[PDB]
Design a protein around this ligand. Structure first.
Ligand code: F2I
Length: 375
C-alpha cells in the first residue's frame, strides 16, 4: 500500500481502467486493462487498427518462446496468440520485476477498443479459468511466488468530443487506509476460479425483491473489473428494472434506455437523481446467518457519456456480474491470502446531498449457504 501506487489507474468511461506496465528488455511501455474477471496476461503483439503500439518480442533480449498457442473467448470478444515468458514490471506498483507468462496477441475480434488507450489485459483471477489450462500460472501468482509481495491487492475505482476520463488506484500487496472511511466488511470467495461471491438479498429503495436467493447467484456471481455494468440474471434483471421504472415513474424514458442501448439527457446540471432509487446488494458475511450490504446510488448505475447517461445495468445469461460501476465508490480488497473480498466506502465515495453509497453490517440472514449454485 504505497503512496507511489495511488492514482496509478486511468481510463475512459465505459472503456475500462488500465495500469502502465513494461515488458521485456529494454522495457517496452504498454497500458494494461486491470481485469479481475479473467486470468490471462495478454498484450497486442501485432499491428491492429485500434493499437498505436504493441509488444515486439524480437526487441526483447529476455523473451523466451514457450512454443505453444493460446486462445481466450470472453463474453465481449476474443483473441488468439502465442505463449512465452519475459520480464514484467509495474512502474507505479511494487519495485520488483518478475518473469511471467505472456500471451502475445496476433489475432483478435471485438477485443480491443478504439480510443481506450490500452494495449493488453491483466487477468487477476485464478489459474482455474486460465487458458489453455490451469497449468499456465497467472501473473499475480508469479508475482507472489517470485517476490515478497503479500498475497493481496485492492482496487479503488473512481467515477468521472471524447469520453470522460476516469481514475483510480491499484494497491498491490496491501491495504491503503487513506483510500477508505468506515469499516471494511468481508464476503468469502466461494471458490478460487473467478472471484466468486454470494448475494443473499437485494433491495431497491429499501424494498426487498423477495426472490429465492439462489436466483441472485443463478449459475454464479462474480466481482469483475473488466466489465462496466452490473449484469443480472434474466429474472433478477426484470424485477430490478420494473422496480427502478416505478420509482422514477415521474418521468418516462424510451425502452432503448432501459435496454442500455440509447442514452438519456437532461438540461446540464438538472439530472433528477432524487427520482432514481438506491440499490442494496447484501453479500454473505464471514459468519453463517450474517451478511452486510453495499448500497449503490444512481450516480453509479447511470454512466456518463445537456448531461447524457446510459443505463449501466443489463441482462446476463452467465450469472451476476458486479462490474466497475458497482466497484466505483467502494474500496475493494481482494484478500487472496484469507480467501475473502472486502468492501468499504471509498475516499472518492459515491455522492449526493441527501444520499450516499454505504457499506453497512451486520444483517442477520438465515441459510446463506443455500444461496449458491451447487455444481
Ligand atoms: C472494459 C470495459 C468495456 N467493456 C467491453 C466493451 C463493450 C465491457 O463493459 C464488457 C461488456 C460485456 C458484456 C462483457 C465484457 C467482458 O467479456 N469482459 C472481460 C474483459 C474484456 C474482454 C474483452 F473482449 C474486451 C474488454 F475490453 C474487456 C472479462 O474478463 C469477462 N469476465 C467474465 C468471463 C467470461 C467468459 C470467459 C472469461 I476467461 C471471463 C466486457
Amino acid at each position: 500500500s504505497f503512496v507511489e501506487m495511488v492514482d496509478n489507474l486511468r481510463g475512459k468511461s465505459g472503456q475500462g481502467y488500465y495500469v502502465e506496465m513494461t515488458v521485456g528488455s529494454p522495457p517496452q511501455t504498454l497500458n494494461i486493462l486491470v481485469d479481475t474477471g479473467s486470468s490471462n496476461f495478454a498484450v497486442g503483439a501485432a499491428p491492429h487498427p485500434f493499437l498505436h503500439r504493441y509488444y515486439q518480442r524480437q526487441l526483447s533480449s529476455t523473451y523466451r518462446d514457450l512454443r505453444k498457442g493460446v486462445y481466450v473467448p470472453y463474453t465481449q470478444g476474443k483473441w488468439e496468440g502465442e505463449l512465452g515468458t519475459d520480464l514484467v514490471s509495474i512502474p507505479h506498483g511494487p519495485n520488483v520485476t518478475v518473469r511471467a507468462n505472456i500471451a502475445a496477441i496476433t489475432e483478435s475480434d471485438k477485443f480491443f477498443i478504439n480510443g481506450s488507450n490500452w494495449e493488453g489485459i491483466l487477468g487477476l483471477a485464478y489459474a482455474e479459468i486460465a487458458r489453455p489450462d490451469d497449468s499456465l500460472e497467472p501473473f499475480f501468482d508469479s508475482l507472489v511466488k517470485q517476490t515478497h509481495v503479500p498475497n493481496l491487492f485492492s482496487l479503488q475505482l473512481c467515477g468521472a468530443e471524447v469520453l470522460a476520463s476516469v481514475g483510480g488506484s491499484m494497491i498491490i500487496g496491501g491495504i491503503d487506509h487513506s483510500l477508505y472511511t468506515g469499516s471494511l466488511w468481508y464476503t468469502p470467495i466461494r471458490r478460487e476460479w473467478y472471484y466468486e461471491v454470494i448475494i443473499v438479498r437485494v433491495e431497491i429503495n429499501g424494498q426487498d425483491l423477495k426472490m429465492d436467493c439462489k436466483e441472485y447467484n443463478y449459475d454464479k456471481s462474480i466481482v469483475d473489473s473488466g466489465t462496466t455494468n452490473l449484469r443480472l440474471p434474466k429474472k433478477v434483471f426484470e424485477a430490478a428494472v420494473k422496480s427502478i421504472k416505478a420509482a422514477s415513474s415521474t418521468e418516462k424514458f424510451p425502452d432503448g434506455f432501459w435496454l442500455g442501448e440509447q442514452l438519456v439527457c437532461w438540461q446540464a446540471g438538472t439530472t433528477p437523481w432524487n427520482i432514481f432509487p438506491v440499490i442494496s446488494l447484501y453479500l454473505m458475511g464471514e459468519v453463517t446467518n450474517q451478511s452486510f450490504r453495499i448500497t449503490i446510488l444512481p450516480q453509479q448505475y447511470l454512466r456518463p457519456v445537456d448531461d447524457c447517461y446510459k443505463f449501466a445495468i443489463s441482462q446476463s445469461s452467465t450469472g451476476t456480474v458486479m462490474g466497475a460501476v458497482i466497484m466505483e465508490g467502494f474500496y475493494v480488497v481482494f484478500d487472496r491470502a484469507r480467501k475473502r473480498i472486502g468492501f468499504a466506502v471509498s475516499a472518492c465515495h459515491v455522492h449526493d446531498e441527501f444520499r450516499t453509497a454505504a457499506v453497512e453490517g451486520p444483517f442477520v440472514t438465515l441459510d446463506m449457504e443455500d444461496c449458491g449454485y451447487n455444481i
